[PDB]
Amino acid sequence: KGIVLEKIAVEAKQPNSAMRKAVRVQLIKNGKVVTAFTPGDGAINHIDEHDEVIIEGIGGPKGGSMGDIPGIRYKVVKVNRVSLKELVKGRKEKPR
């Protein structure tokens, strides 16, 4: 679980061209900042600052980065106790 500090975007490696959205997130158990990628299409708009967010691994080979996102190891899964997949597909609107 983490607190969203800021919303940012990341450029895909070399051949791909896109700005992958993400958030800098402060984790509570240790107070540490990690960056997490927000899957979906309007996910970064469904997410806001100071929001509590749940942080999974992004997959990726050695528990690491995935695809054209160079240096992001984590996924967002829940936003203020609501799944981002449902927020993105419209259902289950956000509490706050």
Next chain:
Amino acid sequence: AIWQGRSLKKPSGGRIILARKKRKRELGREPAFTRVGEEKEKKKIIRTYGGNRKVRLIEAIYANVFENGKGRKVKVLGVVENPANRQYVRRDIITKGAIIETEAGRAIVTSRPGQDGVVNAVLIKE
């Protein structure tokens, strides 16, 4: 000295770290210093593991002395020649291997007055 358990050192020399607290059953007691008294032979009674009984002598007078199967109660005078400790002949303290000056002469102890509460001794032939 109280605790008579294991030592905190391996024969190698290494340290032991006690995995448990000390149990009541692996303790000891303050020793009897069976000295010579003037009179009024002094003893205490110890309740021990099992509710058993020990008689701990603190001041001895008489020292049953033995020769070849014949005994007599012969009034300790003093202590000489304790191989256990020289401070013991100074303090006039009795133990099992001690020599005691008595009526009827010198006698080597054979009892453990801290345990059995009596002094039994054997005449030395000279």
Next chain:
Amino acid sequence: RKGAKRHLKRLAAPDQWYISRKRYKWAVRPRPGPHSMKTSIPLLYIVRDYLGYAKTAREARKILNEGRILVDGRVRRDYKFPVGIMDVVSIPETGEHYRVLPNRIGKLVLHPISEKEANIKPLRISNKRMVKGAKVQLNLHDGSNHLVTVDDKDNYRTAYTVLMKVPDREVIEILPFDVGAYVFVTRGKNVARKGKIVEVRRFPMGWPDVVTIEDENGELFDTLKEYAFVVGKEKPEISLP
């Protein structure tokens, strides 16, 4: 930790009880008594499970306190009382007697018998002290003790067996441990096996002595002398299996 055990879990129970280990959590912890835990079972299990005169321990305790079950001619009212090998469990109201003996599987069973044999109990002697009064105390495998005199102290030896008339405790028929003696094994691999003794080996230090035994079909097997129980001179004479 701080002291003794007052409980027993039915899985941690002896392997020789016929107990149904997973049905409940607890089992009767036997009292100290005549025999050992390895050669005994409690009277509750005998009254409730083996004979089936009760489905419940309250009924069984009522029975035992009424006094309907004897063990070697004596009323036993405690449900934790140990009942052991070669013990006679009598129910007079029903006219039944049973000998607690072991099975070949190694478990304890009740072999039915009649009154005549039911007034008999064979006792392996198992030790011999000299007690004050210069008397001889035979220390028997049911934890029992019999006093004899320095006249027949030599007729009495350790591994021998004594037939005993139990509600009175009068020795009859000493049976010695010798070659040709009929024997009944009580523990081990060759448990409920019987035959005549053939050989004894000694094994210097505290290693137990061993006996070689010949069965009825001529086979020939070894076990421990302490597990070899004498029942007869040439015939078991106590109706074993």
Next chain:
Amino acid sequence: DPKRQRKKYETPSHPWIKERLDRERVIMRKYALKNKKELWRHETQLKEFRRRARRLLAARGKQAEVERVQLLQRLNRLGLLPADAVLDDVLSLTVEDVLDRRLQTIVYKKGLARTPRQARQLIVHGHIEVNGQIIRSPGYLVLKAEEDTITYSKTSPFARESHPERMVIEQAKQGGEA
């Protein structure tokens, strides 16, 4: 570090083999199975028989002879082998033989159901007896001695010969491969 009840069915090593999929699709339609789980359950039954047979081929006496005898008499009792059978025949057996020893299938046979799917419904709604006992588990493997005692329940409308569905089922008296 305790027991932990384990599944009695094995899933395939790869989920998307075309050969296995086709074969299993055919079996599932023929025998009217709800679940690959059910099929794999019977496959696993067979596999365990086979593994025992293998071990006992490559085994030695006084035990592994007992288990040989036990395996063969179990399979005889289940109706998978004849009494004059051998471990070679175990290794010849098939999941189809197992599924043929299901109750659903024997009720599609014994002219009792007209369709394996209707056999399933009869079993589950409580219209089949095996040795006087209602069984509602269509996966119940029938013993070769219980097979001839299969019948409609006494408390079943299908036991009334005037019943419409009974009349249809006996309009089509058929059996054989099921």
Next chain:
Amino acid sequence: MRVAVINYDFCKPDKCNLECINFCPVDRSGGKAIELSEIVKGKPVIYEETCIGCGICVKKCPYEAISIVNLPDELEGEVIHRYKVNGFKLFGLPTPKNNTILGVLGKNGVGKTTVLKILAGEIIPNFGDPNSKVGKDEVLKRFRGKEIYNYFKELYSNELKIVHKIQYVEYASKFLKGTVNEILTKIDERGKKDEVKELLNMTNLWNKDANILSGGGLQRLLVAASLLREADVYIFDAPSSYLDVRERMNMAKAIRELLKNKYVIVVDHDLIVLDYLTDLIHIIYGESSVYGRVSKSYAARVGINNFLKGYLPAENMKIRPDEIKFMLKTKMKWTKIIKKLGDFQLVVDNGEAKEGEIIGILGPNGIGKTTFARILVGEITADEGSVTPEKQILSYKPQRIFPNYDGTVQQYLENASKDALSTSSWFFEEVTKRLNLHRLLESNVNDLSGGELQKLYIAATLAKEADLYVLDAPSSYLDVEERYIVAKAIKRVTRERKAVTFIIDHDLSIHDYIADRIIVFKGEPEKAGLATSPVTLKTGMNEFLRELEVTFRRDAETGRPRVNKIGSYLDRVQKERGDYYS
């Protein structure tokens, strides 16, 4: 809603590197939730409106100075009852505890009476919709899984013979006739009438008739009725109202001596008798007229000190920003009235009432004060003696409080006055706001709490501009912060209008707070009421307490008063020194 709190004793902004502000997400994202301040010794302050909890500061502070607390909320729960779609809601009920006596302390407007009716079967919860008209069944089915299920199962299967003393003593008074002796012999089923008499001191009133009874005499009667009735559950809603200190002590004694194997639940605002009389006390917290949540058991003294401090240390709730305080601090004369109402002679021994000074009235439960106020308002005329100047603009507020009007609060205050609601008025911004009636303007009156109603009647009575205000039992049905607020309101209005006030009450805290003079009534209760000239505060208090032989100790650092056990070292000292109520 969880936020952070600093201890400020462990905080050392010098030897810290300020890890809190530095490792705060909000400060990092630009906002402000923690920040330094010279309001304290250069130490940090936390703004609850922005802190989101999350504890980073907690586990970064080396000197574990920061903690997370809980603020209450009208969001999360399993709402038990809603009176109206936007009126009021309740989260949780306390379980009634087979043999112990349960207290229910709370504040005014939070759900005490509501809890009690739910537990008494008077009303059904209706968890969500005030509508849906479904009771007994679905309620049980919904409470399935709990122990209160068993309670309600028996209650609705009428396997327990519950009684219920109610909060409105006059609404009860209306429904009985006769006099006390035959009332009691008719209602009794346990044969303890003598014991009850000897406890509650009901010998004198043992033959008086119910209709002519004083407030506390009537209270004693109802309480006795309840006690004598046989039941399994025994509910008492504010059994300390209209009583004097000794009588409420006797009442507590009666309850806990005569009910010792029964479920007993007690709502009362008097911390003294709750300390006594309670084994356990649940606390009810929330926002008056909005929501109420119940707490845990919280044994009496702990529950009280927690209710006073705010914090409850089992829910980790800060239920109030601050603590209870326990603060510290001619125009008409008459002749010595004699009066006689059949019996109960009364003599008053005249005074002067200079300017706008407040005059308290103290005395036992059964002599005058109400007769006296009735005389002043003119409802009764004296056998002798009269006031001068008579014929002066007047107001009044008796102890006959019960819900009668069918309109709303805005109408009540309107027909009372314009200053009652004109925000133009200092009167408004002092009284009606500090009393929080702006949150009840659109609430009908016949559905109100005792304390909201009391506040309303007081508001009306003080809005009617006059020259002689008379308020009897104004502090009844009220909690302690409201007692003191109401007192300040009275003092303010009275010193603004430079008028007279005659407060009758049994709350020496009030009298000490405001009363710049008082009048003591002495004599045999119900036979003779012998008042006196107005006396200064401490003297009249000391005399009122020398009578009844009661003594009080006030904490110094707070001021909490507590009665001293009879015969105690401090009782003896305070008596032989004459410093009753220090």
Next chain:
RNA sequence: AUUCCGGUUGAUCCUGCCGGAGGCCACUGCUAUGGGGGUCCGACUAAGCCAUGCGAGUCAUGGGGCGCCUUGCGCGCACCGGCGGACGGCUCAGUAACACGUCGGUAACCUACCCUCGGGAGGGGGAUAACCCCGGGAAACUGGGGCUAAUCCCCCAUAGGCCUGAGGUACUGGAAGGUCCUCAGGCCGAAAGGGGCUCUGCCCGCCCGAGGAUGGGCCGGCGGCCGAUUAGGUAGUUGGUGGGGUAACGGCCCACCAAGCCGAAGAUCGGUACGGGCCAUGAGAGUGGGAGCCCGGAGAUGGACACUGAGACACGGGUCCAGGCCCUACGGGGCGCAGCAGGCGCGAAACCUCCGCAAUGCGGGCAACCGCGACGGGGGGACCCCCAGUGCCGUGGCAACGCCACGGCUUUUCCGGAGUGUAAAAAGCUCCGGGAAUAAGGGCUGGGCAAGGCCGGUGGCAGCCGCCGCGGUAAUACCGGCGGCCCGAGUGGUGGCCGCUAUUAUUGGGCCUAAAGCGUCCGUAGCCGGGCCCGUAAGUCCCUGGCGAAAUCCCACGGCUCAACCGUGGGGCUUGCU
């Protein structure tokens, strides 16, 4: 199923790593009809803090009393006295150790309750609760005086116990510092002939001794992690003589003598960790884990110390320090849930402040019986597993694997009811009634990899992407509709372990050019070692005795409808040791 597939090139073959594909564990998204069985559910972070209630009491046949029954018989109440509370229950901090496992030992020790045998119960005396008078203190708690009993307490003697000395050699043992006999000198030193009945006998009981049993203590052999960027360590340390102490051996401790002990086959130090039975995985070899059930151990905020008792250095007893909290009349007093429930807090991460002693057992009791948050019973929960459901039949039609219509059936599940079930209830089971109603998703859809040459939108943006890679105006690769595939009451995501991996290789890998032969030689330990004969029989092999708990694993057979589950029996397992 002893398996492969995709990815380095313009193409090829390799090496090699990444990924897929399988199972299990934990969290988690969407979704959810039922039953049964089970060793599941605040273990992973906080052995952090705790509101409330409960978790150990029983005996009226030990004793004197207080009360109620008009009294009798009898009932109740506490108190003294006994017994128990040292078990059970929880947790895994600490601990790399004889802690654990296993084989053995104790001739070096303790053991209340229990069994057997053999004996004994003699003579005196005293106090004090309860009760009565008065209280004190905020409480917690507690004082003074009077009165009384006992299976309470004390004394005396007799038995008995311990020590020493002498000698006899009756007992057992493999072996006598042991037992026993006789004699000496000493020290310690019992007991309730109580209570009850059908009373002249019986029952339950008291003390001593001998043994046993039960439960422990202590010793030893073997056995089981990591690190050398930890190489010397140890000073009562190794041993001895003499003692003390202990239940008991012992440097356990002491005095005095000596210089030993451990170590490169790795000591010491550091790190991590409760140990095992077992569990997961895998063709196996093996790798990994060691919360839940059993066995053992340890601990009860941290640390230290004692009393009482057979047994505690005592989770629901005591004392102090540290630390924290609570009540207070500020004088003082009390608490530490790693018991059941329940909370705070922590966290990604786990239930009801329920019912009952009816079963199983424990304690007490002569007994009946009483109590027990142990245990049992329920409930909550996508814990695991087993069995099922979401309709079936005909005809007719269709864009025919399936759907639609028309008719018929059934009712497992849903609704209602009755019996049984249950400690009571619920569930389940049998029966009645009603009615196809009441009940399917999740993921994927370019290749790996089963499944779309379909359509609409976006247009290097948005987005997907485990890897390869798609997307810059015709996109089967994003979003959506239609369709289809996989599994299906579940399906996906994240992390971890095994497998894949012959990428740790004993089986079974490689070192010219791909990672890799010390620059070369010499040699210590270690390992490998020519041929014949003789011997031994240590390894090795065979056979046999005793052990390696139960559960768990395999198999058959039986009982719950089958199954899961349970029982009977056979086998195996424990590294083995002997």
Next chain:
RNA sequence: GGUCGGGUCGAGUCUGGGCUCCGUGAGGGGGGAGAAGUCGUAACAAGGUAGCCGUAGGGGAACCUACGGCUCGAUCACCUCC
């Protein structure tokens, strides 16, 4: 039981010396991606001075020079083994 002491297991409390551990954190260092950039053109073809190792010195930078070695060096001229 107190009060004096005399012995003991003794936690703790003050302190000074070391030894690490943790939470931070100025200021220097290099490393890895990326972005297009800046100076040059070191290397691969004899890469336009053949390349590389070792040592040493020097240089904006790739790099250069020296001594010894290697071919993982091309071409043409010799003898030889094939």
